[PDB]
RNA sequence: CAGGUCUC
RNA sequence: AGAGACCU
């Protein structure tokens, strides 16, 4: 992805967008009972804090494009994907309205309570002034889509989270693109039931982990994934995406039968206009972040990906054995033979993309069973019964949550959550856990869970 | 002050 | 009808 060009919100007609500056994160009762390094996000060009200059590092991610229109790989790779996933047939029927807003079993309903983006946040209007639960209308929603149209640009904000005390010397806090409410609604009316089939189906033959429940998918996956393991890491991975992977996309979607009108909508998403602060800019390629489908598109990307750089980089590759999930960039696969991901990240360089060894070395060491991480879990065998794979969140990840937040009142409901993954790392970590949230006064006025119970109610999911 | 998934 | 966890 890159920056095509930036221009004055008065030479382009569009309204200013500025946002919060100040993070609503704040150092929780625990800030002093556990270690941690990250802090909150620089969100202001003058925080004290900084050593570079924020916005080129806010805008740094946009990295470039190399290849506009794919090759041999990535046409054979598409098409491989497109076939495997021709067995779910995905209805490719355009979704009603009233169901694109307002949800289905398999698609969650337009989120009422997040803004409603360009324009209708500079004009106070709100989603719930258009939609409503109860009655299910879309007769305003039809009226403000003619009104307003789509394409509509994107309305761009800093994300108000933790990050690493390195991140914070660099300026490289995260951006968030708020889609407007009509391009949501148009997303979700022409790819809705490809969503619904990607949810219920999380696994290898979408290649996807989008809905999956750690808890139980993670004894699925070393069965899913059979042989040796190859995984690695991406910088900067949506932002990197040069328009090649959109074209890739396209020819993955009309494969499977999409109509030449709905395929069409992916030149909106490779070519994107957003406002920040007071100036609009263009973006040409880069997987918006804030659109509906970023997630599964992402990941439909990422399958592409893995098969080009595998048969353009290796002789013999065989597409049909390759064993993959992805969730957005992050990554785990396997293959019959070991993968060298050294190699991949040499032809990854070639396609603009940036891969970085797995276990965050400057080396590309083998990844198995033992060291690897999937949505930042390890994969520990149960004691007694080996075959259930417990999902190992470091406790240095939970120690980082658990020292801040952005509102007290919620503080018995985070502590449980953080139990909820912090046992699975066994009984002695998981006490020292708890006693030293019970180290302080508030911590004693908790309803934390008790280890047994949890590993018992884990159990309970397989019948176990 | 976005799009999602998961869980209480 | 709420909350928290996690991914971009
Ligand atoms: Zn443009």
């Given at each position: 992805?890159?920056?095509?060009?930036?221009?004055?919100?008065?030479?382009?007609?569009?309204?200013?967008?500025?946002?919060?500056?100040?993070?609503?994160?704040?150092?929780?009762?625990?800030?002093?009972?556990?270690?941690?390094?990250?802090?909150?996000?620089?969100?202001?060009?003058?925080?004290?804090?900084?050593?570079?200059?924020?916005?080129?590092?806010?805008?740094?991610?946009?990295?470039?494009?190399?290849?506009?229109?794919?090759?041999?790989?990535?046409?054979?790779?598409?098409?491989?994907?497109?076939?495997?996933?021709?067995?779910?047939?995905?209805?490719?029927?355009?979704?009603?309205?009233?169901?694109?807003?307002?949800?289905?079993?398999?698609?969650?309903?337009?989120?009422?309570?997040?803004?409603?983006?360009?324009?209708?946040?500079?004009?106070?209007?709100?989603?719930?002034?258009?939609?409503?639960?109860?009655?299910?209308?879309?007769?305003?929603?039809?009226?403000?889509?003619?009104?307003?149209?789509?394409?509509?640009?994107?309305?761009?904000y800093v994300k108000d989270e933790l990050r690493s005390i390195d991140k914070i010397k660099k300026g490289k806090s995260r951006l968030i693109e708020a889609s407007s409410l009509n391009d949501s609604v148009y997303l979700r009316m022409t790819f809705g039931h490809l969503y619904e089939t990607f949810h219920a189906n999380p696994g290898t033959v979408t290649g996807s982990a989008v809905g999956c429940?750690?808890?139980?998918?993670?004894?699925?996956?070393?069965?899913?994934?059979?042989?040796?393991?190859?995984?690695?890491?991406?910088?900067?991975?949506?932002?990197?995406?040069?328009?090649?992977?959109?074209?890739?996309?396209?020819?993955?979607?009309?494969?499977?039968?999409?109509?030449?009108?709905?395929?069409?909508?992916?030149?909106?998403?490779?070519?994107?206009?957003?406002?920040?602060?007071?100036?609009?800019?263009?973006?040409?390629?880069?997987?918006?972040?804030?659109?509906?489908?970023?997630?599964?598109?992402?990941?439909?990307?990422?399958?592409?990906?893995?098969?080009?750089?595998?048969?353009?980089?290796?002789?013999?590759?065989?597409?049909?054995?390759?064993?993959?999930?992805?969730?957005?960039?992050?990554?785990?696969?396997?293959?019959?033979?070991?993968?060298?991901?050294?190699?991949?990240?040499?032809?990854?360089?070639?396609?603009?993309?940036?891969?970085?060894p797995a276990d965050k070395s400057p080396c590309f060491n083998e990844v198995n069973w033992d060291n690897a991480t999937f949505l930042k879990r390890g994969f520990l065998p149960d004691e007694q019964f080996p075959f259930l794979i417990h999902p190992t969140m470091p406790m240095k990840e939970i120690h980082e949550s658990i020292r801040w937040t952005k509102d007290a009142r919620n503080t018995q409901?985070?502590?449980?959550?953080?139990?909820?993954?912090?046992?699975?790392?066994?009984?002695?970590?998981?006490?020292?856990?708890?006693?030293?949230?019970?180290?302080?006064?508030?911590?004693?006025?908790?309803?934390?869970?008790?280890?047994?119970?949890?590993?018992?109610?884990?159990?309970?999911?397989?019948?176990?």
């Open positions: 992805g890159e920056i095509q060009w930036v221009k004055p919100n008065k030479e382009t007609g569009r309204l200013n967008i500025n946002g919060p500056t100040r993070t609503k994160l704040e150092p929780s009762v625990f800030h002093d009972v556990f270690e941690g390094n990250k802090e909150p996000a620089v969100l202001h060009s003058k925080d004290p804090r900084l050593e570079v200059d924020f916005e080129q590092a806010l805008f740094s991610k946009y990295v470039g494009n190399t290849l506009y229109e794919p090759d041999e790989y990535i046409k054979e790779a598409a098409l491989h994907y497109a076939n495997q996933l021709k067995q779910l047939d995905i209805d490719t029927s355009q979704m009603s309205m009233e169901e694109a807003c307002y949800g289905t079993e398999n698609l969650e309903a337009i989120d009422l309570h997040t803004s409603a983006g360009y324009p209708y946040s500079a004009l106070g209007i709100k989603k719930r002034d258009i939609l409503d639960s109860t009655t299910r209308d879309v007769s305003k929603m039809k009226f403000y889509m003619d009104k307003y149209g789509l394409d509509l640009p994107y309305s761009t429940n750690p808890d139980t998918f993670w004894s699925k996956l070393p069965i899913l994934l059979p042989g040796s393991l190859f995984a690695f890491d991406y910088s900067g991975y949506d932002a990197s995406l040069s328009p090649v992977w959109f074209r890739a996309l396209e020819l993955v979607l009309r494969e499977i039968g999409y109509s030449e009108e709905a395929v069409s909508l992916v030149e909106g998403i490779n070519h994107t206009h957003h406002v920040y602060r007071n100036k609009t800019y263009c973006v040409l390629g880069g997987m918006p972040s804030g659109m509906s489908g970023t997630s599964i598109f992402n990941s439909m990307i990422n399958n592409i990906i893995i098969r080009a750089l595998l048969i353009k980089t290796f002789k013999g590759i065989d597409l049909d054995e390759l064993n993959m999930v992805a969730y957005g960039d992050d990554v785990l696969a396997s293959y019959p033979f070991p993968i060298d991901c050294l190699e991949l990240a040499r032809t990854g360089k070639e396609y603009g993309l940036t891969m970085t409901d985070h502590v449980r959550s953080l139990c909820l993954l912090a046992w699975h790392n066994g009984k002695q970590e998981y006490e020292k856990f708890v006693s030293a949230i019970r180290s302080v006064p508030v911590g004693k006025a908790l309803a934390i869970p008790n280890y047994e119970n949890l590993r018992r109610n884990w159990l309970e999911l397989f019948h176990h």
